[PDB]
């Protein structure tokens, strides 16, 4: 939680119009949940996904 | 039939809730500050304060020209001045309710041996009283919770048979003198 918040506050301070960080796995326990650390705007559909949102 | 008295009295009350933080913390600070042994030495001084508050709180419902309030209320303040807890200018019956546990714990013989400088720590006073090194005006006192009255504060000294005040050395110094 703290490690995704640090990255998210850095990449929102640096002027990106919005971001979204997801950490999936068994971060605590034996059943494996996910996370969703999101902020700002975020486009999913259409053709501007190719040049406006940068995924990794 | 016997010629015995069975009149006894417990001198402490235990709290209603046993595991309560910041009751535990405050009493541990009062144990460490005054060199006491267990919780029961705080619960004992909490009990004599609760007897003094309660008797003054009864005397505050009678009016100022009551017979019983004027007699028994002046005899309550007299003891609290006498043991040095109250002062002399605060002898209305409403500076009783402003007394605390620490006023009563500052008057033990242990903290007074520490205050006069006959010890060098609050745990050094417990042993120096308990090893019979401390006398009050003539009399060796062997009890650390001996509440020192105001007139007996000027006579607290080092017990003329002791190695500290008197001079005949103890068990250890004489054996080392034998091995000299």
């Amino acid at each position: 939680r703290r490690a995704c918040y640090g990255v998210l506050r850095f990449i929102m301070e640096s002027g990106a119009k919005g971001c979204e960080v997801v950490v999936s796995g068994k971060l605590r326990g034996q059943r494996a949940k996910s996370m969703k650390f999101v902020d700002g705007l975020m486009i999913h559909s259409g053709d501007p996904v190719n040049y406006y949102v940068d995924t990794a | 039939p016997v010629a015995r008295s069975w009149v006894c009295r417990k001198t402490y009350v235990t709290p209603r809730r046993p595991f309560e933080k910041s009751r535990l913390d405050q009493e541990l600070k009062l144990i460490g500050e005054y060199g006491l042994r267990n919780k029961r030495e705080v619960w004992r001084v909490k009990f004599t304060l609760a007897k003094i508050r309660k008797a003054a709180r009864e005397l505050l419902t009678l009016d100022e020209k009551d017979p019983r309030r004027l007699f028994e209320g002046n005899a309550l303040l007299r003891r609290l001045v006498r043991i040095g807890v109250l002062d002399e200018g605060k002898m209305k019956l409403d500076y009783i309710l402003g007394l605390k546990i620490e006023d009563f714990l500052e008057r033990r013989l242990q903290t007074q041996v520490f205050k006069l400088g006959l010890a060098k720590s609050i745990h050094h006073a417990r042993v120096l009283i308990r090893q019979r090194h401390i006398r009050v005006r003539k009399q060796v006192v062997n009890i650390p919770s001996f509440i020192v009255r105001l007139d007996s504060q000027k006579h607290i000294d080092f017990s003329l048979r002791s190695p500290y005040g008197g001079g005949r050395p103890g068990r250890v110094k004489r054996k080392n003198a034998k091995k000299g």
């Binding site: - | 508050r53 709180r57 505050l60 409403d94 309710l97 402003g98 007394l99 605390k100």
Partner: protein, 218 residues
């Protein structure tokens, strides 16, 4: 940085109102938490009282938010109580501390018997209710402490009441209702007409009327 959006914020930020008691005297609402930070501020202290998970049924499971009950206040002064509910517990705690700063009331403190020194207790017997929880406060002699349950004790200590007898009827296990009933009882200390408040009120100007010429410069 604070940029005030109300007339009261523009007056407080420009040092034109010298206490919180003017804003209490003219009964005005407070919409910005930085007014309370300006006046009380460095003497305020908060405690989270309960973090409560609540669950809305949806068709894909349960949706979970977390309510936080935050008490706040200045020992000798004022008290607040705020409840915020959110998807994150840190967001709920921060919104609840804002809401607890905005609901800050003054408490009236009186004497039990003789009137010597400073006040210590409740002035009279006040009650306070929130959904089948009554709380009653009773005035107590100098030095008895708060004789009460652990949950209203935090609020009564944060108020500056030093000693008080208490009684609670009702389902006091629901902590939000028990917190919101002792807060209601210590709100009614300053709306109870005792015979010293029988003097006829002498009126003075509202802050909006006294500084109506500085408030057009902005």
């Amino acid at each position: 940085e604070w940029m005030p959006v109300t007339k009261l914020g523009r007056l407080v930020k420009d040092m034109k109102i010298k206490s919180l008691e003017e804003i209490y005297l003219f009964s005005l609402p407070i919409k910005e938490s930085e007014i309370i930070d300006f006046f009380l501020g460095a003497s305020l202290k908060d405690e989270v009282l309960k973090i409560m998970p609540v669950q809305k049924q949806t068709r894909a499971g349960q949706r979970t938010r977390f309510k936080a009950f935050v008490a706040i206040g200045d020992y000798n002064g004022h008290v607040g109580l705020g409840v915020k509910c959110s998807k994150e517990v840190a967001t709920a705690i921060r919104g609840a501390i804002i809401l607890a700063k905005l609901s800050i009331v003054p408490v009236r403190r009186g004497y039990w018997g003789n009137k010597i020194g400073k006040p210590h207790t409740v002035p009279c017997k006040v009650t306070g209710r929130c959904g089948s929880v009554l709380v009653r406060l009773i005035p107590a002699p100098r030095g008895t402490g708060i004789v009460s349950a652990p949950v209203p004790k935090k609020l009564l200590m944060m108020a500056g009441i030093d000693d008080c007898y208490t009684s609670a009827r009702g389902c006091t296990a629901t902590l939000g209702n028990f917190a919101k009933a002792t807060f209601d009882a210590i709100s009614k200390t300053y709306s109870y007409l005792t015979p010293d408040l029988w003097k006829e009120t002498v009126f003075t100007k509202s802050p909006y009327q006294e500084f109506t010429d500085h408030l057009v410069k902005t």
